[PDB]
Structure 1
Amino acid sequence: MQIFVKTLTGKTITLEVEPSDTIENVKAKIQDKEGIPPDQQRLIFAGKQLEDGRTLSDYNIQKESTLHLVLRLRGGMQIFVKTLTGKTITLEVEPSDTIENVKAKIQDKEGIPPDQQRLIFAGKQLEDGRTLSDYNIQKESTLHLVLRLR
């Protein structure tokens, strides 16, 4: 069922699901549709905020309608990034994030181009193509940012 949503500002690209998908699969179609991660979004339909573990047909999500959805201030996992100057910034991440995604997040916070960022963890240099999980980076882990001198 092609289903759209209304928000405070407005953002909706090609989307589509059917009531058979799980409560996490609906938040998945919003991933590529609304642009906010799944654990940062909480969905509500006519005053019923359906959680994960309840079929979307048990309380039929009407097809092809405009729903209101509210967004969280935080996700479920933050890591810290430390600048040489001592400043600490907090990143909302997911274990599947590559360290290249992490650098794109730093650019959004600090305006530094990812090309210019070197990241250190557990005494080792991090490689763009790997994921937080590959490095065993976990909630409240601390990365160290060094800028390239080149």
Structure 2
Amino acid sequence: MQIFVKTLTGKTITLEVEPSDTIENVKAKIQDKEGIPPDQQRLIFAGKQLEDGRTLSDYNIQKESTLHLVLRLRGGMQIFVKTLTGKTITLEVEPSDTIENVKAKIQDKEGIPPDQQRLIFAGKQLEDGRTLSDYNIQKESTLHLVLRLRGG
């Protein structure tokens, strides 16, 4: 079934869902369409916040209902990325984020294409397919960004 997710601006997303889908699932679909992490989304129906572990049917959400979405200013975890020129940027991340998605967030924030990005932590170059957790990158760790020609 279809549901509609509108924001304060007016932007309206359409989603295909099931009544047994949870609010976490709806937030994951919204991340798939809009790139917004679920811990930066608040969903509201009938004037109240929806809790992630409940289902659409739990909250009386029938077909073509409309939820409201409010974006947070920040999620649950930030890391720091230091550049060769000494600049410090702050990133919203998840422990399961791949290095490729970290580079994509860096592109969002600074405009550097990921294929030019080389991230280093604890003296090691980070491989695109692995997660922050794989490298034991914790909250407020510092990555070092270097640009590189991926071909010399």
With normalisation by structure 1, the TM-score equals 0.86
CA spacing shift, 1:133–1:149, aligned 2, 3 Å: same
Using a 3 Å threshold, how does the CA distance of structure 1 residues 57 and 120 change in structure 2: closer, same or farther? same
Between the aligned partners of 1:123 and 1:91, the Cα distance in structure 2 is: 20
Q: Is the 8 A contact 1:27 1:41 kept in 2?
A: yes
Seen in structure 2, the aligned counterparts of structure 1 residues 133 and 33 have a Cα distance that, compared at 3 Å, is same
Change in 2 beyond 3 A, CA 1:30/1:109 = closer
State the identity %.
100
Displacement after TM superposition at 1:35 (Å): 2.9
The C-alpha deviation readout for 1:80-134, integer Å capped at 9, x for no partner, is 1001222110111122222122112212222222222211101111122221111
SS in 2 for 1:131: coil
SS of 2:9's partner is: coil
Distance across 2 between alignment mates of 1:100 and 1:55: 31
Distance 1:45 1:116, change over 3 A: same
Residues 60/86 of structure 1: CA separation in 2 closer, same or farther (3 Å cut): same
Residues in 1 aligned to 2:33 and 2:100: alpha-carbon distance in whole angstroms: 22
Deviates more, 1:24-33 or 1:122-131: 24-33
Aligned residues: 150
Structure 2: segments with no counterpart, 5+ residues: none
Structure 1: 5+ residue stretches without partners: none
Higher strand share: 2
Aligned in 2, Cα 1:149/1:20: closer, same or farther, shift over 3 Å? closer
For 2:109, what is the secondary structure of its paired residue?
A: helix
State the shift of 1:64 in Å. 0.4
Inter-CA distance 59–35: structure 2 relative to 1 (3 Å threshold): same
CA contact (8 A) 1:12 1:34 kept: no
